[PDB]
């Protein structure tokens, strides 16, 4: 079967050097003229940069001369001036060329950092350029006389050598010379010779270089490029509509700078032809060749020579290289962004009446957005005669069409997005609800995920046009379908502030009120009791309730009892569906507990009940918060009655120490520390005074004289419930606020003795100012840093997607509680939850299999684990997965917005990166830079060293900057001898044995070491635990999984040690290697298998390694990537995400996985 010829749908792409003939293939004519347009009739001047004959008609299906104007005549080339009449779009397509008189270097291959022509010819750059400028003569094919082949002579030397050597000696100069070198070059001969030379001499200096060069040469052979190609004979011209001359207002014109450049090249070239035909002296024609080289170089990539300036304008003219590069990056225009139809934006407002599955959409906006749909529907029913008339109807805004829009809106979700998109939840899909007004209404419960306040934040809407986009929006991007953070299984739909103050005020108990101690049949008459004013919202009461438990087998058990609770809890219980116990609502319901309620509800009753539950919780929260009449007054903030006294005593301390300094008893510095310490203590005193007073000081009467309970004071309830405020800010409101520091960071020894409730004075405020500005600047900067980190992260991962289902390995990491120094800084439960057991675990007794090998440990399995005392669970990690080029779902974990195991095809690397990066603003050596350092694998500043090998050690030689440590293992040879600088204080015992990876000194260690001297599991544990230290210290929840996938990408590369297939020291993909040695262990050589060594590459480095050049050209240096790929003739197969986004085809993740896989298998097949 003929495969095909004309346009199929392509796969891969290929890049290479271009032939004079191949360049001529694209060219439909030679531009012989600098002229553009006629200057009156603006028609293109034939034949020039803008030409109808070479390129195309100026207007659709119309000849230039005007003879053939009819759409009937198409493939006709007009007799007058040949122009085939065809759409004017082709003027945006067709190429052309220019035949250069003298050969010309392609500046991309001359100035690329490892100069291509230069290291191909094994010639230095300066020599090559020197020759190019006609400043020296260079030998070519020297024959046997006196002279080296690449040797460079001068005027006198060339003349002398010529007088001696006649023929059988050859030298040229300028571009023609270099081209002669490249053309004369035989790669094959060099190959043979170099292999031999490699073989004979043993020196590292010789053979390293030798081997690198021969490999380079064979790589360039394999191609298909040949050397002469780096030198330009023919120069292609960019199609004119891509560098347009188009008119403006006032009759003015504006055009691309490429026309200036091309014009320059053409003029100088033609002038060179002239100077050749006029028989000009060498000095002149040479200058013309130099100028032409400069012109071509300026056209291709400007700035690697003189930086030509555009006409009359100082600003340097943009060149083709700059046309490719873009800027603000690192941004290739799919990357930075692209304008999109069917979309809009505006200020957002509240809309609490909404179910969380919908959003208020302004009438006008929805009208303008769904316009084509409205047209088509209108004429579908017949309300509009034709599409034209349908426009005129909606343009009239006739009364009918609103009813049609109600139809087109119903089942048809819209995408809402906010500005700082961090994690994937930054975009969510809702159902449009038509709303009067220009503002968008956004569900309160979602305000968390968006990080969207109501202070004038704006949101953007997008319409999912195609059917697949509607179903993708509804089954994936839908609001209700992500109720959980992808970072951690904890609910992101957790009620925020007003609502939690509502449920808190509802469920809390006072000591006494109306209805205290009575008895009621159930929640119904409890609410009925409250609403009529008889019983207080909160009063201690026994009521009969019926709870349910599903603890039968998939079946709900009913039970009823008398519960000691409050009227409020009783009323609220009406909302709690089915199987949940009454215990959950019987507490005080803080922002934390109110969340665990929802979480438990989800993991018990499923999605739908959790959704409707959450909705109800929000509604009742708002309503009862409004009923509550919560407020904030000036007397709501209570200053400790003991404050002034504390201030006084602490103030006496300073004067004690001051007198001591005047008496010389204490020095200056120690004194400073003392006074700073006394004030620092005073602050804690006032804080822990105001907190006692504020918290418990409601003293209230029940029956007998007195009792005291937690306060009903507003600001307290706010800070306590989790609504808003915190003990720090409350402390700053009532008690004195802090100690400040000068710009230096030297902390002022006179703290602010006044707070916000009292007035601050001039000094106190002026001193607070610096802290303020440093705060704003710092946070505004940490935004940028966070962004950078996420970027590095997704660049490092991306294409990692769940590919296979089960790789089926017993391998994994050993999961224990973190158990740090105190008790249990994080439990075993959270660490092992949602993960999959590597192997079947014991009871304390055995042949008892409680959990059998690979079973996703869901909450129940985990609680079974907790019932027994089990202290340890080996867990499959993404880092150890046997599957190549991705991760198997069975080894990943369950985690998702859904509680079920991860689906085949979801791209986990991206959401991992996003998950690590979203909280990144919250982080305050330590901090966010610590995280960056960890992921970059950077060796610390003053690191320790670990024993290279086990066995007894001892000290030898002396004081040469290093006092050597000689290691002595039991059985093995001694020879490992390391040189440790003696001016650092050691640890290791001169008379004792040390295991490999022991402390031979103190200080932080480089993870490279931890990988090498300890091992893979050790280093992944080190990374994950350290970054988790950074985050967890800040109260950030990030599952180990994501850091573990990042880690997997970090160690991706490994350097070979042994042999039998590939080269000795090559850094190479383990996936590649392991696949090749697993393939090698059988068949092939019976076993030739090659050893490797795992390598730790930092994220920014690991991102550098990519097979796809379309991808590399995105975030890397474009100019270098395209060259470096072009020489090798590198053929990009796509495969990964970035390239497919760039080329504008389906993502090979997601819904796309089905397609790409289906195609990928169809490829390399029958």
């Amino acid at each position: 079967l003929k495969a095909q010829t004309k346009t199929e749908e392509f796969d891969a792409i290929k890049i290479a050097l271009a032939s004079p003939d191949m360049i001529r293939s694209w060219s439909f004519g030679e531009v012989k003229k600098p002229e553009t347009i006629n200057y009156r009739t603006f028609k293109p001047e034939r034949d020039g940069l803008f030409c109808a004959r070479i390129f195309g008609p100026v207007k659709d299906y119309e000849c230039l001369c005007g003879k053939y104007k009819r759409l009937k005549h198409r493939g006709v080339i007009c007799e007058k001036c040949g122009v085939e009449v065809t759409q004017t779009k082709v003027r945006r397509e067709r190429m052309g060329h220019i035949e250069l008189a003298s050969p010309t270097a392609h500046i991309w291959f001359l100035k690329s950092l490892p100069s291509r022509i230069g290291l191909l010819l094994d010639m230095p750059l300066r020599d090559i350029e020197r020759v190019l400028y006609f400043e020296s003569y260079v030998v070519i094919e020297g024959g046997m006389t006196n002279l080296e082949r690449q040797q460079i002579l001068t005027e006198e030397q060339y003349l002398d050598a010529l007088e001696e050597f006649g023929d059988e000696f050859d030298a040229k100069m300028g571009a023609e010379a270099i081209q002669a070198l490249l053309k004369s070059m035989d790669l094959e001969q060099e190959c043979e010779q170099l292999r031999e030379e490699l073989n004979e001499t043993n020196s590292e200096t010789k053979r390293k270089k030798l081997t690198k060069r021969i490999k380079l040469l064979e790589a360039f052979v394999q191609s298909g490029n040949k050397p002469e190609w780096m030198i330009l004979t023919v120069l292609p011209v960019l199609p004119p509509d891509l560098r347009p001359l188009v008119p403006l207002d006032g009759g003015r014109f504006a055009t691309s700078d490429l026309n200036d450049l091309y014009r320059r090249v053409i003029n100088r070239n033609n002038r060179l032809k002239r100077l050749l035909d006029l028989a000009a002296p060498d000095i002149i024609v040479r200058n013309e060749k130099r100028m032409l080289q400069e012109a071509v170089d300026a056209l291709l990539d400007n700035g690697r020579r003189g930086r030509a300036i555009t006409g009359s304008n100082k600003r340097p003219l943009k060149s083709l290289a700059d046309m490719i590069k873009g800027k603000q990056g690192r941004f290739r225009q799919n990357l930075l962004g692209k304008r999109v139809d069917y979309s809009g934006r505006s200020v957002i407002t509240v809309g609490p009446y909404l179910r969380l599955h919908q959003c208020g959409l302004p009438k006008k906006m929805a009208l303008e957005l769904f316009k084509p749909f409205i047209y088509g529907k209108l004429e579908l029913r017949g309300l509009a005669t034709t599409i034209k008339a349908a426009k005129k109807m909606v343009e009239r805004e006739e009364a009918v069409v609103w009813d049609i829009l109600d139809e087109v809106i119903r089942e048809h979700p819209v995408l809402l997005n906010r500005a700082p998109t961090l994690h994937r939840l930054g975009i969510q899909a809702f159902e449009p609800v038509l709303i009067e007004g220009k503002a968008i209404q956004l569900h309160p419960l979602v305000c968390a995920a968006y990080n969207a306040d109501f202070d004038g934040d704006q949101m953007a809407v997008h319409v999912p046009l195609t059917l697949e986009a509607q179903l993708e929006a509804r089954a994936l991007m839908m609001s209700t379908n992500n109720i959980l953070s992808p970072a951690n299984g904890e609910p992101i739909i957790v009620p925020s502030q007003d609502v939690v103050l509502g449920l808190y005020y509802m469920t809390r108990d006072c000591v006494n009120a109306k209805g205290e101690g009575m008895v009621l049949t159930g929640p119904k008459e409890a609410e009925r009791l409250y609403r009529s004013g008889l019983a207080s919202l909160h009063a201690r009461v026994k009521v009969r309730i019926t709870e349910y438990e599903k603890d039968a087998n998939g079946e709900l058990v009913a039970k009823t009892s008398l519960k000691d609770t409050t009227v409020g809890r009783a009323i609220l219980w009406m909302i709690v569906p089915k199987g949940l116990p009454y215990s959950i609502v019987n507490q005080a319901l803080g922002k934390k507990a109110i969340s665990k309620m929802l979480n438990t509800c989800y993991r018990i009753l499923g999605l739908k009940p959790t959704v409707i539950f959450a909705d109800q919780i929000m509604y009742t929260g708002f309503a009862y918060a409004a009923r509550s009449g919560a407020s904030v007054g000036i007397d709501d903030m209570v200053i400790p009655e003991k404050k002034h006294e504390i201030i006084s005593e602490a103030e006496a301390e300073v004067a004690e120490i001051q007198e001591q300094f005047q008496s010389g008893l204490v020095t200056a510095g120690e004194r400073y520390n003392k006074v700073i310490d006394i004030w620092a203590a005073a602050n804690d005193r006032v804080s822990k005074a105001m907190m006692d007073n504020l918290q418990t000081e409601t003293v209230i009467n029940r029956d007998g004289q007195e009792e005291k309970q937690v306060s009903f004071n507003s600001i307290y309830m706010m800070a306590d419930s989790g609504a808003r405020g915190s003990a720090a800010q409350i402390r700053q409101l009532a008690g004195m606020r802090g100690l400040m520091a000068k710009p230096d960071g030297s902390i002022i020894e006179t703290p602010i003795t006044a707070n916000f409730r009292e007035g601050l004075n001039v000094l106190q405020y002026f001193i607070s100012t610096h802290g303020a500005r440093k705060g704003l600047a710092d946070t505004a900067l940490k935004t940028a840093n966070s962004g950078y980190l996420t970027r590095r992260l997704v660049d490092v991962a991306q294409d990692l997607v769940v590919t296979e289902d089960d790789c089926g390995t017993h391998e994994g990491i050993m999961m224990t509680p973190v158990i740090e120094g105190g008790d249990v800084k994080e439990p075993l439960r959270d660490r092992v939850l949602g993960r999959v057991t590597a192997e079947d675990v014991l009871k304390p007794g055995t042949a008892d299999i409680l959990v059998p090998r690979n079973t996703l440990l869901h909450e129940q399995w985990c609680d079974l684990l907790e019932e027994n005392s089990v202290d340890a669970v080996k867990v499959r990690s993404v880092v150890s997965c046997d599957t190549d080029f991705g991760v198997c779902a069975h080894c990943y974990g369950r985690d998702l917005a859904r509680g079920h195991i991860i689906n085949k095809g979801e791209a986990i690397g991206v959401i991992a990166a996003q998950s690590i990066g979203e909280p990144g603003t919250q982080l305050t050596t330590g901090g966010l830079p610590r995280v960056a350092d960890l992921f970059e694998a950077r060796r610390p500043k003053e690191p320790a060293i670990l024993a290279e090998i086990s066995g007894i050690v001892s000290f030898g030689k002396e004081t040469k900057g290093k006092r050597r440590l000689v290691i002595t293992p039991v059985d093995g040879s001694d020879p490992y001898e390391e040189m440790i600088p003696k001016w650092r204080q050691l640890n290791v015992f001169e008379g004792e044995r040390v295991e490999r990876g022991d402390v031979i000194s103190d200080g932080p260690e480089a993870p490279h070491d931890i990988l090498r001297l300890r091992g893979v599991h050790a280093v992944t544990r080190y990374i994950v635990n350290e970054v988790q230290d950074v985050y967890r210290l800040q109260g950030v929840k990030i599952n180990d999984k994501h850091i573990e996938v990042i880690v997997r990408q970090m160690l991706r590369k490994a350097t070979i040690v042994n042999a039998g297939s590939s080269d000795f020291l090559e850094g190479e993909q383990v996936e590649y290697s392991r696949v090749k040695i697993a393939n090698r262990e059988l068949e092939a050589n019976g076993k030739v298998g090659a050893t490797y060594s795992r390598d730790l590459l930092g994220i920014t480095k690991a991102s550098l390694a990519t097979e796809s050049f379309i991808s590399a050209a995105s975030f890397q240096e474009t100019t270098r990537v395209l060259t470096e790929a072009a020489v090798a003739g590198k053929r990009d197969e796509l495969r990964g995400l970035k390239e497919n986004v760039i080329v504008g085809r389906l993502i090979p993740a997601g819904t796309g996985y089905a397609y790409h896989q289906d195609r990928m298998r169809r490829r390399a097949a029958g």
Binding site: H357, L467, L476, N481, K608, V611, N903, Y1153, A1154
Partner: protein, 89 residues
């Protein structure tokens, strides 16, 4: 509307392939070659398809079998038409 798709994800696993199958079916209905397998509530083809997934009367297998049958239905018609094309000889 269909507020949660969870039951649909229950029937066919992947949660993606669900979107795909539902898309195919919703297209069978939208460009009208076919009609619903479940009462139309004014639910658009999107949600009708999803409902059809929940009720287990629509998934990849079923659709494939149906299409494979229809190919042969058309073979039955053109049986006399294309055999008269023996002019290939």
């Amino acid at each position: 509307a269909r507020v949660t798709v969870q039951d649909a994800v229950e029937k066919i696993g992947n949660r993606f392939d669900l979107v795909l199958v539902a898309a195919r079916r919703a297209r069978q209905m939208q460009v009208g070659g076919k009609d619903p397998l479940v009462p139309e509530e004014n639910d658009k083809t999107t949600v009708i398809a999803l409902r059809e997934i929940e009720e287990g009367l629509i998934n990849n297998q079923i659709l494939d079998v149906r299409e494979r049958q229809e190919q042969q239905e058309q073979e039955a018609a053109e049986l006399q038409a294309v055999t008269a094309i023996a002019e290939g000889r």
